Point group: C3
Chain length 114, copies 3
């Protein structure tokens, strides 16, 4: 899995602990070995939400399985909570997209997964 | 909706007015309340197009509905126009992808939309 | 086509030659005119893989056709090789997603491709 998140919050506010916590959370909620988990957080971005430059963010959780029409709402609760707790972004100013990737459509160690 | 765009044009050339104009445009063309619209512009990127580092960009407009096989060409006219007008990027050196996201596959305020 | 790749490796390690080589490689492997190829490399990112901040990266190759359940494994061999050769990232610390985009869902020169 890959969790990516882009935000206009300052880099200083983005800590090693945040990425390590997200990493562990994503492994748990998707039931994936953490050796497969990538986390990518991009601060200091030029963004607006609702037409204003107040703190906001947009991100994606991509995985082969684990994401799914009936699991994603739970995933969203957990991920919005950790981001709000560390970064302070309001829930009405952030999105997370969930992408279920076919195994033939993502590669790792020089090969696709199918 | 989310409009994201990555470019090698200088940050100084990227203005608050550009993001606010895009925000209003996206709300209009997708018939979405602007309270749901996110805009994300990333300058000073390391890019090539056609094998050269002249100004270029790539972006995505993602939405639950509003994008669609018969509406996207119109969207593209409008978005290419505003980006060329502000940033000066030639149309043959930029892409915009349109992504129709299922409601179960994106979250806002701690919940998916389905 | 668009090849995008995000990494925590230093910008200095990312050279004009790397982007030009990728550009030529992507044109060859997808059988696309290089005039349509965009390359986007983003260094100095805040990332983890397997819970650690050692060098890693995540990227996407998007195209109208050329990518496909039976061609992607070959694409992955080639792209992992060039990235490892230039940037030194281990194969077990990087992903590349392949996205087959419908022609109606991407625009160039102010129009969608369908």
């Amino acid at each position: 899995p890959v969790f990516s998140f882009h935000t206009n919050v300052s880099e200083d506010k983005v800590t090693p602990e945040l990425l390590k916590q997200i990493s562990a959370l994503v492994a748990r909620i998707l039931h994936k070995p953490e050796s497969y988990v990538a986390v990518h957080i991009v601060p200091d971005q030029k963004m607006t939400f609702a037409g204003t430059d107040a703190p906001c963010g947009v991100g994606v959780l991509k995985s082969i399985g684990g994401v799914g029409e009936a699991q994603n709402n739970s995933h969203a609760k957990a991920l919005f909570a950790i981001i709000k707790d560390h970064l302070g972004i309001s829930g009405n100013r952030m999105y997370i997209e969930f992408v279920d990737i076919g195994a033939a459509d993502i590669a790792f160690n020089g090969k696709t997964f199918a």
